Ligand binder design. Structure first.
Ligand SMILES: CC(C)c1ccccc1-c1ccc(O[C@H](Cc2ccccc2)C(=O)O)cc1
Lengths: 268, 268
């Protein structure tokens, strides 16, 4: 019944708001510099980076970089910390997906393990525009250009994310839509090492119906949006890989830099 | 309109039947399926290959294993031959899809160029079962066991297609279904280098509606099958990506020789 699919759609949207302090709506309100009720400080060079520590809460360093964790590492660590924030956040959203917590404890861990970064980049697109990405809860805005100019390695960590987000955002999706799509991603079952696949696919079968109806209702004039969105799941998978291998490179060229256990545990 | 979507399906099916010798319906009668009226020649071991490869309808080389060319290599190059045949079959099919030829020729070459590998592994799965793959227009059956028993490079060449195949076949799709899915794969839109993505996506949109109608009417009880088929695309891409990987590795085994020139040329 439709009435049941809409109720689940309302449910998930609801938990989505409660689990993510920064929705796409808040994000676009800040990005479209019309809503000047609170604008972001912009980082596009080293000076701004320093000055950034001023206006925004940057526990990081302000002055010298190189001989004291150069700019590149500093941002990378900063980015590392947020990812941990997001996982914890995403993990809280997951518990609310009907049926998820009733699965084998092991699978729960496996679903999170593979689905988390795929989710981080999906939601990360909400904080991006062709020119940049929001940081520190919207208060800041770091330039894509400044990012694409960091030290040899770190210099190409976000580019594949921007490329994904610009075309993904062109789908004009909203929080209520993403809420369901985010859940569909978690309850895969095609995930490596699962014990009970049928119970997982039964949940996702629901999420997909929910999403199909939600997209029809929310975007009547958008033919086949449902399918276009599912295919986007390939671009996601590909991004994770580019990243994971990229991560492997730093680890070797930076034996002094560390990887937060929670993020380290996910990668494998 | 459903009428128009029922026409496009039958059209593609008709083209499909005439472009591909071995149909899934046929191949299935031969495989695990009984339908015994001419049992294929089973290659399960080295001698089986040797002792058949001399009676089987294979055109390229013969059983000569004794410091006279390696077996693994002869088998690998054999797939290349068949894949190159397959590529011509697909092209012949691509041309029957409404709108395809009306596209920028450069874009057609780009679409076939990148859609071909995914189409091959998809269709390969029709000739596969959990224990082996039909060979030579269906006159043979090379076991999965023998394939993983191969040397060192070549021992993991086909294993991932088997893992993909077994899950893919779990969907129980038939030639009428595969005919539309295949078309959808060719009419992507995200292939690198395209020049005019719009028409390509318009046709895919039209092809997607067809696959959706087809699956609903053809598999009424199989819920959300459409969504599940579309996510098999991630699996394909990974297969494809991971394949070019061994390809580069193999490129570090056999190479510099003067009797290969005009042969190496047929397969870039
Ligand atoms: C917005 C964030 C998720 C992000 C994504 C992709 C690339 C970089 C970042 C990023 C986020 C915050 C950054 O600066 C600090 C990071 C930080 C936050 C809290 C404690 C320690 C560091 C901040 O904005 O608060 C720098 C980069």
């Amino acid at each position: 019944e439709s009435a049941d699919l809409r109720a689940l759609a309302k449910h998930l949207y609801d938990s989505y708001i409660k689990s993510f302090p920064l929705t796409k709506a808040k994000a676009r309100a800040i990005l479209t510099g019309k809503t000047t009720d609170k604008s972001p400080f912009v980082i596009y060079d080293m000076n701004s980076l320093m000055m950034g520590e001023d206006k925004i809460k940057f526990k990081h360093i302000t002055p010298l970089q190189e001989q004291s964790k150069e700019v590149a590492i500093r941002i990378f660590q900063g980015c590392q910390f947020r990812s941990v924030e997001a996982v914890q956040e995403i993990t809280e959203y997951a518990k609310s997906i009907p049926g998820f917590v009733n699965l084998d404890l092991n699978d729960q861990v496996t679903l999170l393990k593979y689905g988390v970064h795929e989710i981080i980049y999906t939601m990360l697109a909400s904080l991006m525009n062709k020119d940049g990405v929001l940081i520190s809860e919207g208060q800041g805005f770091m330039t894509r250009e400044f990012l694409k100019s960091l030290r040899k390695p770190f210099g190409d960590f976000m580019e594949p994310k921007f490329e994904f987000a610009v075309k993904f955002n062109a789908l004009e999706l909203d929080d209520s839509d993403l809420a369901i799509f985010i859940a569909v991603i978690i309850l895969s079952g095609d995930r490596p090492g699962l014990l009970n696949v049928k119970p997982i696919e039964d949940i996702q079968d629901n999420l997909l119906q929910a999403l199909e109806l939600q997209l029809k209702l929310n975007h009547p004039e958008s033919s086949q949006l449902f399918a276009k969105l599912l295919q986007k799941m390939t671009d996601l998978r590909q991004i994770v890989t580019e990243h994971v291998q990229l991560l492997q490179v730093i680890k070797k060229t930076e034996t002094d830099m560390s990887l937060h256990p929670l993020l380290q545990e996910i990668y494998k």
